[PDB]
């Protein structure tokens, strides 16, 4: 009974491993070898956005790429105008402990969550000239880690109880749940089609979930420790993950296998937050060593350093148009680089 | 800048003024963190001085917050690294799970992001320990063989009115945690042990003194004196 089930599971796992090993014919480093390197890239602090009184723990750029929402552990949710260093709004949160932040694609709502297990949605552009809590989505058992919008009505939230959940804002209750992870789901990212999303947990593995049917499609394991952040390739068929292994890894969707690993002997610190560029040629990263390391997406060579922060960089964002990159660190100042 | 832009700058200045006033009000309080396990009287000790639960108290007109989150705390413990202290309460009477308490203290003490956050240790349930060591049914040497060769350190003077066996047991338990703390302390963050009971009422004065010492060390560090 149990022995037969274990044997069948082992046989299926070995079959999948053989299938993915047989599909690996040529390394991507061997294909893009004769491609001109991006060269050394220097980016300066164009705008420093001061006004947070505690460590910034999340971030998000608006669809317009002009307004960015920053969540910090002092209980505020400032919505900066990035061009002019202007604070459009300053939302005081019910609970100081905030670990995520999201700005809706339409722009009307923001969302924040933390150790309170509740994802709060704030409505911004309304009457009476105030931002007020619209829906306090509750139902997660562990701490909330990353919340991301789909439309004005649907949200995806990953929690510390080894699960993700797709909520309807109007109903206030989960419409879909995704389970199967063993450790805390520490990060989340969507796809341009908004039909699939990849989530990384502390069991040193990532999974690909489907929003509609709610069934896992692929699982990726190439990491030795917890995946502290994940970002998704602009194409829609790949993504990149950052662990505490001091290594990034580029995974793909169709071939179901790791493509490259980004690492350097000099860096040992964990990776907090990863992001791509608009084209996908360049891959930003953020490290615990109080700076950022720029890695080419096709050469795995350190293309530059963004050493402007005093404490560890927490969140890392790239605008929709790709004009600038915003790095928010525990120094309470988040900077714009270009 | 046009009229709308100067007005937006004025609104931003009002927003920043409100933020700075709120921050000045918020920085006045000393945040803590309550950590422990099952069968540890963290609930009792917090009730005596009274997702995430919070208690608020104040002594000498100084305000405190004590947060306790209701395993695998290696992730959410990143948030509590600006706290002035971490409060660690353990069931020193229990011998079966005291070793996993030592392992937990190793986990928090050697944490990467708590590399400068001092810890306050409360060896709770001291009267249970006294009655257990008077009963003699359970021996510490059964669980910790090195207890047999351990002797009570000199210049101890715990308090007048306990048996030598009780003091020996409690001092051994304290020394285990102290050695774990001092293995890799490096002087950035230190450990404050205390023998708390279930009925003791002076559990806020101890925390006040410990927070005062932590702030004194931080002030020494900022003045470049150390």
């Amino acid at each position, epitope marked *: 009974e149990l022995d037969q089930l274990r044997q069948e599971a082992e046989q299926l796992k070995n079959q999948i491993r053989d299938a993915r090993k047989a599909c690996a014919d040529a390394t991507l480093s061997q294909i893009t070898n004769n491609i001109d390197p991006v060269g050394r890239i220097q980016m300066r602090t164009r705008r420093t956005l001061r006004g947070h009184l505690a460590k910034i723990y999340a971030m998000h750029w608006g669809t317009d790429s*002009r307004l960015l929402v920053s969540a910090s552990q002092d209980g505020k949710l400032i919505i900066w105008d990035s061009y002019t260093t202007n604070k459009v709004h300053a939302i005081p949160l019910r609970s100081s402990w905030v670990m995520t932040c999201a700005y809706a694609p339409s722009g009307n709502y923001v969302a924040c969550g933390g150790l309170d297990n509740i994802c709060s949605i704030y409505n911004l552009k309304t*009457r009476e*000239g105030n931002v007020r809590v619209s829906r306090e989505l509750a139902g997660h058992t562990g701490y909330l880690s990353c919340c991301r919008f789909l439309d004005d009505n649907q949200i995806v939230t990953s929690s510390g109880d080894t699960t993700c959940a797709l909520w309807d804002i109007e109903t206030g209750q989960q419409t879909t749940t995704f389970t199967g992870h063993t450790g805390d789901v520490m990060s989340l990212s969507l796809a341009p089609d908004t039909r699939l999303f990849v989530s990384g947990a502390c069991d040193a593995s990532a999974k690909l979930w489907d929003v509609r049917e709610g069934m896992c499609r692929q699982t990726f394991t190439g990491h030795e420790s917890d995946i502290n952040a994940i970002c998704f390739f602009p194409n829609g068929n790949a993504f990149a993950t950052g662990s505490d292994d001091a290594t990034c890894r580029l995974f793909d969707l169709r071939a179901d296998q790791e493509l490259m690993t980004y690492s350097h002997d000099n860096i040992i610190c964990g990776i907090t937050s990863v992001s791509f560029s608009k084209s996908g040629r360049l891959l930003l990263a953020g490290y615990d060593d109080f700076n950022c390391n720029v890695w080419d997406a096709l050469k795995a060579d350190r293309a530059g350093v963004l050493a402007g922060h005093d404490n560890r960089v927490s969140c890392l964002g790239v605008t929709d148009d790709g004009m600038a990159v915003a790095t928010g660190s525990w120094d309470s100042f988040l900077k714009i680089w270009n | 800048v*046009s009229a709308e832009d100067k*007005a937006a700058a004025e609104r931003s200045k009002m927003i920043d003024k409100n933020l700075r006033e709120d921050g000045e009000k918020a920085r006045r309080t000393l945040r803590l963190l309550l950590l422990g396990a099952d069968n540890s009287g963290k609930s009792t000790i917090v009730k005596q001085m009274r997702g995430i639960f919070e208690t608020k108290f104040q002594v000498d007109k100084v305000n405190f917050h004590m947060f306790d989150v209701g395993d695998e705390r290696r992730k959410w413990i990143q948030c509590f690294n600006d706290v002035t202290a971490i409060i660690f309460v353990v069931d020193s009477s229990d011998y079966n799970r005291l070793q996993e308490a030592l392992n937990d203290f190793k986990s928090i003490w050697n944490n990467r992001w708590l590399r400068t956050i001092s810890v306050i240790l409360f060896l709770n349930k001291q009267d249970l320990l006294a009655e257990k060591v008077l009963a003699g049914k359970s021996k510490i040497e059964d669980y910790f063989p090195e207890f047999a060769r351990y002797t009570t350190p000199e210049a101890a003077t715990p308090e007048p009115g306990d048996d030598p066996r009780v003091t020996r047991a409690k001092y051994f338990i304290r020394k285990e945690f102290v050695d774990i703390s001092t293995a890799s302390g490096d002087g950035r963050h230190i450990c404050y042990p205390h023998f708390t009971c279930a009925v003791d009422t002076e559990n806020a004065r101890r925390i006040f003194n410990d927070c005062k010492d932590i702030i004194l060390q931080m002030n020494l560090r900022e003045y470049n004196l150390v």
Partner: single-chain antibody, 230 residues
Framework: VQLVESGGGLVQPGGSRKLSCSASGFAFSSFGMHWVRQAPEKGLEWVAYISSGSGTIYYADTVKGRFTISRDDPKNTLFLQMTSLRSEDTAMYYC??????????????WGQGTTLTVSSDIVMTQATSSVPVPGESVSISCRSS???????????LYWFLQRPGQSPQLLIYRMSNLASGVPDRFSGSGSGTAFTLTISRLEAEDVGVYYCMQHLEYPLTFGAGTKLEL
């Protein structure tokens, strides 16, 4: 939201008067406030402006030195003090709210006006005064003395509709954006010194007078207005 203003009446010239406006349904501290007068035989024209926190206070040229504006947030009230009024000062006074942040819609709500009977500037022109017109698209053209295009790329033109015997309501802010609740039929397009307003599928209760305002710099200037009749 409601804005109700009390004051006015038959006052001999040279006297002193106070108008008090009370606001309900919104946070009064956040919004900035405007006092705007409309003569019985003339169009709208700016009078005074008080900012949030009362940090900045602006007055028109005509009423500078003999008018005063102030606000009380805890009472949620606005005080306008008028000294040594003139014979042409007889008009209806409106209180207008405007919030000033990126993407905001200023002048969105106009309070109910009072009545007060007595006993350089960017010149904006509306060529058409009365246009007879339902079911037909109507275009209203407003000309500005100078280009209303700042360096940052924001054009500052606002369109207001006044219904017969009713306070004006904001229609288009910054010449492109449509305020909340404004039907999709209205549209606005143009460039510096030449702006248009297009209305499609006109129906009942759509008539009124449309005023064009510039917010490029103080003092604010209103257009003469274009009247629409059946």
């Amino acid at each position: 939201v409601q804005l109700v203003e009390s004051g006015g009446g038959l006052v001999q010239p040279g006297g002193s008067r106070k108008l008090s406006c009370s606001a309900s349904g919104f946070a009064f501290s956040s919004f900035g406030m405007h006092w705007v007068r409309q003569a019985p035989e003339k169009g709208l024209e700016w009078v005074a402006y008080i900012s949030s926190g009362s940090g900045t206070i602006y007055y028109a040229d005509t009423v500078k030195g003999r008018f005063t504006i102030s606000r009380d947030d805890p009472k949620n009230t606005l005080f306008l003090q008028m000294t040594s009024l003139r014979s042409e000062d007889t008009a209806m006074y409106y209180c207008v709210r405007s919030i000033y942040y990126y993407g905001s819609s200023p002048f969105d709500f106009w309070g109910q006006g009072t009545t007060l009977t007595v006993s350089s500037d960017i010149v904006m022109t509306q060529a058409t005064s009365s246009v007879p017109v339902p079911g037909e698209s109507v275009s209203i053209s407003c000309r500005s003395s100078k280009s209303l295009l700042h360096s940052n790329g924001n054009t500052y033109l606002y369109w207001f509709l006044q219904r017969p015997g009713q306070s004006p309501q904001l229609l288009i802010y910054r010449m492109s954006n449509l305020a909340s609740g404004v039907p999709d039929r209205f549209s606005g397009s143009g460039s510096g010194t030449a702006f248009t307003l297009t209305i499609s599928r006109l129906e009942a209760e759509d008539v009124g007078v449309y005023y064009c305002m510039q917010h490029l710099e103080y003092p604010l200037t209103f257009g003469a207005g274009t009247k629409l009749e059946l």
